[PDB]
């Protein structure tokens, strides 16, 4: 249900994720690390399942951030893929893939993998 | 099929992987980088399904290499997980995880992920 996903979320390392879920399945917002301030802010775009199974099943979603804004360009992009689980304490559990632009010779070591848990703080 | 795993395989980057598959599931051997100078060699150990399914299924397998030998110690370990497919053109299709020993602060960026296809050519 779009309303439950929409809000301000934070992960275990102190990074900020502000997102709005639209009724057609679109996700839009901004991502920021713990330093706060204006720019550490990057644009994010994603999709979610706007018609989830009932049960106590989670809602599947995913989003991408290319690490370039008007102050820095790290030449890399991260994609998070996971599920929104609502209830008393709503959480988004994910796994992510960070790929950097490399030359052909170093392409075998271009991608990092990891996992993040977001806890909600505001709509 | 089964024992067809024993032999010398090469991935797409020229690294060589020599393995012995034990009747009950063990995998033992050595891995060495391209250039191939004799210590670029590292020890590997692993497991595989010793009784695979009889329909057209591949054979599940996996192995680990800690990147330390008598000459170099790169403070990392790689695990490959995949499946063996026998035929006139045999191959082992895998994905791998490379973790480095890091401090607590750099733990989030400790692991790389990739994929490799090993053939006997």
């Amino acid at each position: 249900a779009e309303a439950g996903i929409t809000g301000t979320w934070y992960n275990q390392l102190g990074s900020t994720f502000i997102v709005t879920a639209g009724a057609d399945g679109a996700l839009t917002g901004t991502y920021e690390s713990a330093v706060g301030n204006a720019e550490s802010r990057y644009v994010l775009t994603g999709r979610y399942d706007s018609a989830p199974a009932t049960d106590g099943s989670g809602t599947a979603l995913g989003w991408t951030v290319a690490w370039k804004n008007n102050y820095r360009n790290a030449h890399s992009a991260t994609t998070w893929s996971g599920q929104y689980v609502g209830g008393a304490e709503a959480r988004i559990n994910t796994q992510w893939l960070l790929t950097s632009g490399t030359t052909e010779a170093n392409a075998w070591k271009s991608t990092l993998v990891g996992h993040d848990t977001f806890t909600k703080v505001k709509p | 099929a089964e024992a067809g795993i024993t032999g010398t395989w090469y991935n797409q980057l020229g690294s060589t992987f020599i393995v012995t598959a034990g009747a009950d599931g063990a995998l033992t051997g050595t891995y060495e980088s391209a250039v191939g100078n004799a210590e670029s060699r590292y020890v590997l150990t692993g497991r595989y399904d010793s009784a695979p399914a009889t329909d057209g299924s591949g054979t599940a397998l996996g192995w680990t290499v800690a990147w330390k030998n008598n000459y170099r110690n790169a403070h990392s370990a790689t695990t490959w997980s995949g499946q063996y497919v026998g035929g006139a053109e045999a191959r082992i299709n895998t994905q791998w995880l490379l973790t480095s020993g890091t401090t607590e602060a750099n733990a989030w960026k400790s692991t790389l992920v990739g994929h490799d296809t090993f053939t006997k050519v």
Binding site: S15, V35, Y42, W67, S76 | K109
Partner: peptide, 6 residues
Amino acid sequence: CHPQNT
């Protein structure tokens, strides 16, 4: 220092 995390 990558901006994803601190």
